[PDB]
Design a binder for these strands. Structure first.
Ligand SMILES: [Mg+2]
Ligand SMILES: [Mg+2]
Ligand SMILES: [Mg+2]
Ligand SMILES: [Mg+2]
Ligand SMILES: [Mg+2]
Length: 1336
RNA sequence: GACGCAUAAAGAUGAGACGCGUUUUAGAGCUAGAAAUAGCAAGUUAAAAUAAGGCUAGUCCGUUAUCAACUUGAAAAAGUGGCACCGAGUCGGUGCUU
DNA sequence: CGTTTGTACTCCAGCG
DNA sequence: TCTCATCTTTATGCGTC
DNA sequence: TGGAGTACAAACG
């Protein structure tokens, strides 16, 4: 009577099987409801459930943030317009209306069809005078006469709409820079301040270093060659401070005013000026020259005296584009007359016409045009510019994202300065306009909601609307920044009302250090047995070598302490191997700032120190930190406070203040930390304390501690795993209901965990600092000696990639910059839009322009050819992996391809692990619910957690081979074998059920799980040839109960795996998501187009074209049709797309009448989600994919002998058995060649019965017959592909050796209108069969 | 099986920004021309939208999660489906029982 | 005769 | 693609229930 | 992997 349930849970399916105590799968007759004549169905209690994977909220978050950005951009433009409105009403009162309705066609426009000026001659004259907006912007910057208010508005609105990035902190001032000839002022001011007759007769300026890539090498060599100064600081050590930072941690060179360290012009440099401001401007020109150098690097404009460098560069682009276009046209006409149309008219190619008016990109145009230019003559300059990526550039290209907002701000400020004299209102609210451009909501304030958003946390001081000019006084930024962190941090698990301590808190570090130190044992010659450290010893050890060294080694412990204090000649330490995992890093960091050791050591100020660390952890805005720490300046010096505001900490711990040091034992009065610091002779650590029965901590924690859908909503994590968890729990509940509501004896969950040898684990978890160290050593570079680094810092992704590349770019042969890594970007080699892979094998650090030129592609053939040698050097140094090299060079093997698309992404394993871990405990709490007071929980249902290694070894040892492609039965079979193996193990080794059951309790651990599975085998193999002939009958041992009979139990398993009928059910899902595909299409005379705004007719404006159907509805009604119009009754499926799902559900009859259906029978409207299952003649089943396409729903039941033979013929040389076993299986393969013909006959019969892909089957048969002389291995490997013809799901495509058989989309959902509709429960055991032929 | 610490892999959730891209309109194409066309010239920019839209009207919200049928319930949710054996091509036969 | 569903084939898909 | 933050799953080492 | 759009030709009004 008693039974068990197995589960094989995946991210896209759940397999389930029910087994009795004899390992048989029971079968029952189930009643079937509905109007059909069939009354009951016999069904085996084994099957699988398939469903579409749950989607992560990442793609929704990206859309939501984009929506917010557009909403705020339109508001910026509206603010500028509201400023201009009154003065614009003087000159042109309809100007903003004409701008706003510019999209509409001529007849839809209320005003004149020329937006700016409103008349043809003025509009043409404007577009002739200022061919681009950058001409207008430069003219307004550099022209002192009164400009037109419309032109001023257009320039300002362009800058305010497209305002550049904010990654460069501080006020880069182009108006006080960009004159690279300030080097003269540099040398003069140096001569004034440094008095020992310094060199003044300068040679060539920094222009020589600007021409090539900026580098320490280039700068140093040029300065040595041209300006041999009197001191290295005067010649090199100052000019670097004007351009280049300093990496070494030691002090600077010989002091001119103070010897303290220097660096580039950071946010902390102005506070690093204490080396001169208190000691004296020479360093004032540092900012000037630095900003000149960076702005020259960004913008290739140096000679001109313009005050608009970006606009000047864009105008130079326009001029070069014009001139080179003229030259190219002339050359092509006089040298290649037959290519002129294909280059300059044919927009379907990648010529100039396809570059401008087509869709070709700059790289595609360059690749198309380079052969033509090479074979032509007189194009040397064009080739040079093309190889420099400067030929025929547009003024708005992909790489404008390196323009900081400070450049646009400089141009806007200059314009307002020029025109503020003639338009006084521009003088009045210049500040308002600049704030509109430069305002940006802090990331810690979030959406400025007023209570109606579930993403917002901002707290506002008043109800006044927030604008850039009153944001600072309406938004409570302090509380908002605190809630930003506090809304995401975990609570304490033991005390679920308490926030956790900051990971760097002094209490947390003390708890960690003492909790580790209290369990170490020392032994010596005189000691009889090792004994714990006493309270005095732990106190002395802490104050001696934990508070004076950042990390403590066993060597330090047993040399400095045990041989100097309490002298022991020699000692053995247990409980630490090489180094203490714990440290007082926060203590040392606060000691290097707070010179007062006694302040740290005092107990009374511990609250103040804790609040300081909590502030430095919560807030990272410098003014915010200063405001919070302002109350603590009366304990410290002002220099000390200036240092404190520099101490950034991140990360939060697992335990709270109250748990660690707040709750006290009633009897002793000690806290947990006090017990750790001194607990006499017991020395109980935290785990042993909170579980001690004699201490009140256990009860204090215990007393300090709805639908399943609600609980699932409670748990954190991604929403992807929720679907799988809920579906498998529903499956288990339905199985329990099916078995007379009697709970199963055992539930066996297949866990995705794994045991590894200690060597393998230590290898795979080595420090990334070591990973860099051996590689850099092997390739012999000096990067580590030039840029000292520590393992903690390498957690930064860009820094880690920098060191993995030896400080060079991976797509160009150029150096990177440690001090400017925010410029570069982390490029995905295989693009994000193609494959989800964020592993380091997929990431590369490179300049933003190269990344964005390489849009959604693998690196091009040219890039591969240039950089393959460098990639090979890195691979030899083992900095990059073979996987990374294969990703990088994928363009040499055909680029992106569907065989590369085919695989399991690495995210699926993680989601599977999370789903199984949550499902195990959910099932345990749902099943084992009968508590008791003598023992806490009565374990009614054992939830076994097997590892997949056991079942894989069972399959591979007893030749129950698994081939995924044949059908979906392998999920059900994996569930069945999980149940069998789990119950057999539990019954055979009851003492070790405390290792499998959930809730009971590494090379040795690895060997154990290998040796445990031996009792299934008749003969155990040793390396020397010895065999232990285990008996055919396996008994429990202590009890004598029989568990595994190798005679008949394998027969039962084999019989079950050959069961034809396995309940595969595919979950019917109503589609939700985007209304349609995102591509906006040009206007056409079609009704398939969707209007992208309510007033924009698609026949005139274009629109979207691939609507997503939420569900179909079966409508039986009458439609007017005929050569003379006449209502005819009709039955057909109508697709209710996502856009109008709400419109239909509001009023189905009104919606259908609007569709043109007349006299709809409201009773016969049926909702038909995706994958609704229909059965037709001969068991041909069709799942509904939409209202126009059906999916094949039948499953092929291939015999186990053929499945095993296929797995053996394929994988021919990777069976990984013994040599004799492999040879015998080989002879098996030769002696069963007829299996190929039998399998083809099987597949052909199945196709002719239910697939009905007649032409594809003919192609398959012809290909098989033509290639039947090929080797057996290749025949097997290719015949595995033919199961794409018969797989459940969508018609897809495949290939025999060379013949590619295409797809046969069943685009006819009319055959199903007279079939039987099946409503299948979650397990598929309960059905309701509606015969649609009986509806009329 | 869980927990703390150290190392590491692979992932996740929320916020703030940038750059493109597409769509319609504006930038008078000219010449011989019945001209069906052809020649020639032009080309780089801008405005607007970027899920349709929503109501609590916010510089907010709108693509994640929830869903077999039927009987119930404003809903969430719950409730309903006979057994053994012999077999086996997607489940069948037989015998029991209301 | 004049359509109109029906099949075959091809090709479509916002991104860094 | 940039910036900021928090969190999870698994593997090995040290210590525990 | 569902939609879309052309060409084609059997199939009804
Ligand atoms: Mg599995
Ligand atoms: Mg990229
Ligand atoms: Mg599976
Ligand atoms: Mg969904
Ligand atoms: Mg674990």
């Amino acid at each position: 009577k008693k039974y068990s349930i197995g589960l094989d849970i995946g991210t896209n399916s759940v397999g389930w099987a029910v087994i009795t105590d004899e390992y048989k799968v029971p079968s029952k007759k189930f009643k079937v409801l509905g109007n059909t004549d069939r009354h009951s169905i016999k069904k085996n209690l084994i099957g699988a459930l398939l469903f579409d994977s749950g989607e992560t909220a990442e793609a929704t978050r990206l859309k939501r943030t984009a929506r917010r950005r557009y909403t705020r951009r339109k508001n910026r433009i509206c603010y500028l317009q509201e400023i201009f409105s009154n003065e614009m009403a003087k000159v042109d009162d309809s100007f903003f209306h004409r701008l706003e309705e510019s999209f509409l066609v001529e007849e839809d426009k209320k005003h004149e069809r020329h937006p700016i000026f409103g008349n043809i001659v003025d509009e043409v004259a404007y577009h002739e005078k200022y061919p681009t907006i950058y001409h207008l912007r430069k003219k307004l910057v550099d022209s002192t006469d009164k400009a037109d208010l419309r032109l001023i508005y257009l320039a300002l609105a362009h800058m305010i709409k497209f305002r550049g990035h904010f990654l460069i902190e501080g006020d880069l001032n182009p108006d006080n820079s960009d004159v690279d000839k300030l080097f003269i002022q540099l040398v003069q001011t140096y001569n004034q301040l440094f008095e020992e007759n310094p060199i003044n007769a300068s040679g060539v300026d920094a222009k020589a270093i600007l021409s090539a890539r900026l580098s320490k090498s280039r700068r140093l060599e040029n300065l040595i060659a041209q300006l041999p100064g009197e001191k290295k600081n005067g010649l090199f050590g100052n000019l670097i401070a004007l351009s280049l930072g300093l990496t070494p941690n030691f002090k600077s060179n010989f002091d001119l005013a103070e010897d303290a360290k220097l660096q580039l012009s950071k946010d902390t440099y102005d506070d690093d000026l204490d080396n001169l401001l208190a000691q004296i401007d020479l360093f004032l020109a540092a900012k000037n020259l630095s900003d000149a150098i960076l702005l020259s690097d960004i913008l290739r404009v140096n000679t001109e005296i313009t005050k608009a460098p970006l606009s000047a560069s864009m105008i130079k682009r326009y001029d070069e584009h014009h001139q080179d276009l003229t030259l190219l046209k002339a050359l092509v006409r006089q040298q290649l007359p037959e290519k002129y149309k294909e280059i300059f008219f044919d927009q379907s190619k990648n010529g100039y016409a396809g570059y401008i008016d087509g869709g070709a990109s700059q790289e595609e145009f360059y690749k198309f045009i380079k052969p033509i230019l090479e074979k032509m003559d007189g194009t040397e300059e064009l080739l040079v510019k093309l190889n420099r990526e400067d030929l025929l550039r547009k003024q708005r290209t992909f790489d404008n994202g390196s323009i900081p907002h400070q450049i646009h701000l400089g141009e806007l400020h200059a314009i307002l300065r020029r025109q503020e004299d003639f338009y006084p209102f521009l003088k009045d609210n210049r500040e308002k306009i600049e704030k509109i451009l430069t305002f940006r909501i802090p990331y810690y304030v979030g959406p400025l909601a007023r209570g109606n958003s579930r993403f917002a946390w901002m707290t506002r001081k008043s109800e006044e609307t927030i604008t850039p000019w009153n944001f600072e006084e309406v938004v409570d930024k302090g509380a908002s920044a605190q809630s930003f962190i506090e809304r995401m941090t975990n609570f304490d698990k033991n005390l679920p009302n308490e926030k956790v301590l900051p990971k760097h808190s002094l209490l947390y570090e003390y708890f960690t250090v003492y909790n580790e130190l209290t369990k170490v044992k020392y032994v010596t010659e005189g000691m009889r047995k090792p004994a714990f450290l006493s309270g005095e010893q732990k106190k002395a050890i802490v104050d001696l070598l934990f508070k004076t060294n950042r990390k403590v080694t066993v060597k330090q412990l047993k040399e400095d302490y045990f041989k100097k204090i309490e002298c022991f000649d020699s000692v053995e330490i247990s409980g630490v191997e090489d180094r203490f995992n714990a440290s007082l890093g926060t203590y040392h960091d606060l000691l290097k700032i707070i010179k007062d050791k006694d302040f740290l050591d005092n107990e009374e100020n511990e609250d103040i120190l804790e609040d300081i660390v909590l502030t430095l952890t919560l807030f990272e805005d410098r003014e915010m930190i200063e405001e919070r720490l302002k109350t603590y300046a009366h304990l410290f010096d002002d220099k000390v406070m200036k240092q404190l505001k520099r101490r950034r900490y991140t990360g939060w711990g697992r335990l709270s203040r109250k748990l660690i040091n707040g709750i006290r034992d009633k009897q002793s009065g000690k806290t947990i930390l006090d017990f750790l610091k001194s607990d006499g002779f017991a020395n109980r650590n935290f785990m042993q304390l909170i579980h001690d029965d004699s201490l009140t901590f256990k009860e204090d924690i215990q007393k300090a501690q709805d639908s399943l859908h609600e609980h699932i909503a409670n748990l954190a994590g991604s929403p992807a795993i929720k679907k799988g968890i809920l579906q498998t729990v529903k499956v288990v509940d339905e199985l329990v209901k099916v078995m007379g509501r009697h709970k199963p004896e055992n539930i066996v969950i297949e866990m995705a965990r794994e045991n590894q040898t200690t060597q393998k684990g230590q290898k795979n978890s080595r420090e990334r600092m070591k990973r860099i160290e051996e590689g850099i050593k092997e390739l012999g570079s000096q990067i580590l000696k030039e840029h000292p680094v520590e393992n903690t810092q390498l957690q930064n992704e860009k820094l880690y990639l920098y060191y993995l590349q030896n400080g060079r770019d991976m797509y160009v042969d150029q150096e990177l910059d440690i001090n400017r890594l925010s410029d570069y970007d982390v490029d995905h080699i295989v693009p994000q839009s193609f494959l989800k892979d964020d592993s380091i094998d997929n990431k590369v650090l490179t300049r933003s322009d190269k990344n964005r030129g390489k849009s959604d592609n693998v690196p091009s053939e040219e890039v591969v050819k240039k950089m393959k040698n460098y990639w090979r050097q890195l691979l030899n140094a083992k900095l990059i992996t073979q996987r990374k090299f294969d990703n990088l060079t994928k363009a040499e093997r055909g680029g992106l391809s569907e065989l590369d698309k085919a695989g399991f992404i690495k995210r699926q394993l993680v989601e599977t692990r999370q789903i199984t871990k949550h499902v195990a405990q959910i099932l345990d709490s749902r099943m084992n619910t009968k508590y008791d007071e003598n023992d806490k929980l009565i374990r009614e249902v054992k939830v076994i957690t097997l590892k997949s290694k056991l079942v894989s070894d069972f399959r591979k040892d007893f030749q129950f081979y698994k081939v995924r492609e044949i059908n979906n039965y392998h999920h059900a079979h994996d569930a069945y074998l999980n149940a069998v193996v789990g119950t057999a193990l539990i019954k055979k080794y009851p003492k070790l059920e405390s290792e499998f059951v959930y809730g009971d309790y590494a090379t040795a651990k690895y060997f154990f799980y290998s040796n445990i599975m031996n009792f299934f085998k008749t003969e155990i193999t040793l390396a020397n040839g010895e065999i232990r002939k285990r008996p055919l009958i396996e008994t429990n041992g202590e009890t004598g109960e029989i568990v595994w009979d190798k005679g008949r139990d394998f027969a039962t398993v084999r019989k079950v795996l050959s069961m034809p009928q396995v309940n595969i059910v595919k979950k019917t899902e109503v589609q939700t998501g985007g209304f349609s595909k995102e591509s906006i299409l040009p206007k056409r005379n079609s009704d398939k187009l969707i209007a992208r705004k309510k007033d924009w007719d698609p026949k005139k404006y274009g629109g979207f074209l691939w609507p997503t159907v939420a569900y179909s509805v079966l409508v039986v009604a009458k439609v007017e049709k005929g050569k003379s119009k006449k209502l005819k009754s009709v039955k057909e499926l109508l697709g209710i797309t996502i856009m109008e799902r709400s419109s239909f559900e509001k009023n189905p009859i009104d919606f259908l009448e609007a569709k043109g259906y007349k006299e709809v029978k409201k009773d016969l409207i049926i909702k038909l989600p995706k994958y609704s299952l229909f059965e037709l003649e001969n068991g041909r089943k069709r799942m509904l994919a939409s209202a126009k396409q059906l999916q094949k729903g039948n499953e092929l039941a291939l015999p186990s002998k053929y499945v095993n033979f296929l797995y053996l013929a394929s994988h021919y040389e990777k069976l990984k058995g013994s040599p004799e076993d492999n040879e015998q299986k080989q002879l098996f393969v030769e002696q069963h060649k007829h299996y190929l013909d039998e399998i083809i006959e099987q597949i052909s019969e199945f196709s002719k019965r239910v697939i009905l892909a007649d032409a594809n089957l003919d192609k398959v048969l012809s290909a098989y017959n033509k290639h039947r002389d090929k080797p057996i291995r290749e025949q097997a490997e290719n015949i595995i592909h033919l199961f794409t013809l018969t797989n459940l799901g969508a018609p897809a495509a495949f290939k025999y050796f060379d013949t590619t058989i295409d797809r046969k989309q069943y685009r006819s959902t009319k055959e199903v209108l007279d079939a039987t509709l099946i409503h299948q429960s979650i397990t598929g055991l309960y059905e309701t069969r509606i015969d649609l032929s009986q509806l009329g």
